[PDB]
Structure 1
Amino acid sequence: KVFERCELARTLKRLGMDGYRGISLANWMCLAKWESGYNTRATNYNAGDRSTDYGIFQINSRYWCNDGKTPGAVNACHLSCSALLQDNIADAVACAKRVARDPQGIRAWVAWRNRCQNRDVRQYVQGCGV
């Protein structure tokens, strides 16, 4: 499913993402925008280390979910990577919360550092009523 901007913003707020571990809603929106374009079925294979990025937040199979073909991988969210490809984003959100709980926080996603850090991210939630 490809979410529309505000539709996603409202969904994330309802799922308790606003201010989760100090991360504002607009930051999660910026992250979702640059990682997948708000697309829940997006997948990305990393030829270099044999891991795959799954779903709306492009969560990595090496540490977060299990896809069975990634070498020396762990499953911190204790989920099949398949769960991160559903239209319903509840599981993807619960796993994103787990990633943020780590020492790096939102910084765990390099894309966030490149496209969101120290930027005016208000635009991602403006006009959405959240």
Structure 2
Amino acid sequence: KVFERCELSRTLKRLGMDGYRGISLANWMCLAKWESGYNTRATNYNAGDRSTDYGIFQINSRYWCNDGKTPGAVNACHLSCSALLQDNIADAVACAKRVVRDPQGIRAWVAWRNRCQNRDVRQYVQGCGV
């Protein structure tokens, strides 16, 4: 599913992402926007290390979910990577929360550092009623 901007912001807010571990909803929106264009079925294979990024937040299989084909990988979210490709984002959100409980927090995603950190992210939620 490809979420519309405001539709997604309300979905994320209902799922408890607004301010989760000090991360505002606008930051999560900026993250999902730049990671997948709000697309839940997005996948990206990384030929260099044989891992794959899954879903709306493009969570990597090396550390976060199990896809059975990533060498020496772990499954910190204790989910099949398939769970990160559903239209319903509950599992992807649960996993994204797990990612940020680690020291790096939102910085775990390089795209966030590139396109969101120290940026004006207000525009991602303007007019969405969140």
TM more than 0.5 = yes
Offset of residue 107 of structure 1 = 0.2
Distance in 1 (CA, whole Å) between partners of 2:19 and 2:88 is 21
Secondary structure at the counterpart of residue 19 of structure 1: coil
Offset of residue 43 of structure 1 = 0.1
Offset of residue 77 of structure 1 = 0.2
Secondary structure at the counterpart of residue 17 of structure 1: coil
Per-residue CA distance 1:13-43 (angstroms, 9 max, x = gap): 0000000000000000000000000000000
Runs (4 or more) in structure 1 with deviation over 6 Å come to none
Secondary structure at the counterpart of residue 53 of structure 2: strand
Taking structure 1 as the reference length, the TM-score comes to 1.00
Distance in 2 (CA, whole Å) between partners of 1:18 and 1:100 is 13
Distance in 1 (CA, whole Å) between partners of 2:56 and 2:100 is 15
Offset of residue 62 of structure 1 = 0.2
Offset of residue 116 of structure 1 = 0.2
Per-residue CA distance 1:41-60 (angstroms, 9 max, x = gap): 00000000000000000000
* Consecutive unaligned residues in structure 1, runs of 5 or more: none
Per-residue CA distance 1:61-85 (angstroms, 9 max, x = gap): 0000000000010000000000000
Distance in 2 (CA, whole Å) between partners of 1:56 and 1:65 is 14
Distance in 1 (CA, whole Å) between partners of 2:69 and 2:9 is 33
Distance in 1 (CA, whole Å) between partners of 2:18 and 2:73 is 30
**Backbone CA RMSD of aligned residues:** 0.2
Taking structure 2 as the reference length, the TM-score comes to 1.00
* Consecutive unaligned residues in structure 2, runs of 5 or more: none
Secondary structure at the counterpart of residue 52 of structure 1: strand
Distance in 1 (CA, whole Å) between partners of 2:5 and 2:100 is 22
Offset of residue 93 of structure 1 = 0.2
User: For residue 31 of structure 2, what is the aligned residue in structure 1?
Assistant: 31
1:122 and 2:118 equivalent? no
